[PDB]
Amino acid sequence: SNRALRVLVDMDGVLADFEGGFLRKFRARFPDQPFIALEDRRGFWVSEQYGRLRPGLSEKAISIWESKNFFFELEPLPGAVEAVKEMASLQNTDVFICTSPIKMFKYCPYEKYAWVEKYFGPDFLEQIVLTRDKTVVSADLLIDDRPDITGTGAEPTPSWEHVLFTACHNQHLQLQPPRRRLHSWADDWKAILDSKRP
Amino acid sequence: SNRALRVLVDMDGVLADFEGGFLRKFRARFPDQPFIALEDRRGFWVSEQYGRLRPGLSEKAISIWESKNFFFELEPLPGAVEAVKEMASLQNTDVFICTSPIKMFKYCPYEKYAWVEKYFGPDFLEQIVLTRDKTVVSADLLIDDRPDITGTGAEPTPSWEHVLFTACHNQHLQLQPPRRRLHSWADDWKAILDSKRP
Ligand SMILES: [Cl-]
Ligand SMILES: [Cl-]
Ligand SMILES: [Mg+2]
Ligand SMILES: [Mg+2]
Secondary structure, eight states, rough: OOOEEEEOOBBBBBTTTHHHHHHHHHHHHHHTSSSOGGGGOOOHHHHHHHHHHHTTHHHHHHHHHHHHTTTTOOOTTTTHHHEEEEHHSSEEEEEEEEOOOOSOTTHHHHHHHHHHHHHHGGGGGGEEEEEEEEEBBOEEEEEOOOOOOOOOOOOOSSEEEEEEOTTTTTTTTTTTTOEEEEEEESSSSHHHTTTTTO | OOOOOEOOOOOOOOOOOHHHHHHHHHHHHHHTTTOOGGGGOOOHHHHHHHHHSSSTTTHHHHHHHTTTTTTTTOBBBBTTHHHHHHHHTTTTTTEEEEOOOSOOOOHHHHHHHHHHHHOOOOGGGGGEESSSOOBBBSSSSSSSSSSSSOOSSSSSSSSSSEEEEOTTTTTTTTOEEEEEEOOOSSHHHHHHHHTOOO
């Protein structure tokens, strides 16, 4: 609730299970192709790992998340909806969902709004920021599964502290101190927010 | 081209002729209803002025911009595309298009991306920021036709200076010094940018 601590919450990999949705739909569509089990995922870009696996598989992978209903049908991560609803109800706390669309824009922007409406309600649509460059969005915190966030972004010194949210693709990564992780929504996110308050 | 001066350029009323597109489609769809000529427009919210004109006309007005192809078919303002292309090519200048979607999200986000692709090309899609709250986007300048920009926004002290871009609905407004206007894209926008440079 609305100086408020401002928290940017990423969508794919934090609220929505992109990795699991992708794998399931990839195996269904391309049952004769090899795949990458989640525990074996390494690196942020799915299509790059698939492209190394077999020739043509980058393009096949892309075709999964370019398809209609891919984004809309993603399942929420455990605890994500509940945590963000609670976070948004806290005193002196403003929550925005900060998400980057894919390059093919026929479905993805629309479906992200629709997904937010479905899980958070119409009033939360006000809190969505769509951008490929999150460094130009000012906040105290950014909770996001992408390790390299600057990429490179236009703002060399973002205002936010990036808290890395654990995902299959980043779980083994050693971070440079003092970078921090949120391991799951079961982990103590309130303590992370409180550490940034006056 | 990519510390760079960062300029947020609004879409409706700055790049795209929302007011003229709206009026034309309103008169075509509702030929028996009264309308507001552009010179008589007052206040940012179109639907509010229409609602005062006749009962039910707010809802009719809304139905124009909720329709498919409304946003996509908007015409560029004179000089807008050319100016923003030139601006983006300047040394030490990063340009983002910063636009607020309407509440009904079936078409508007998609069509705004499609509009940018059509006039600026695929590579400029990277520069789009969609948000209802522009105060959380950091920059040196925001060129926008809306007079009241904070509304109220979550950031009480935005980083940008708001330069009011003239539109039919704001052309008579007296601003509190030191607020500034860009009267049209024919006006000297380079001088405004240069005033913010080191
Ligand atoms: Cl999923
Ligand atoms: Cl138009
Ligand atoms: Mg993510
Ligand atoms: Mg505008």
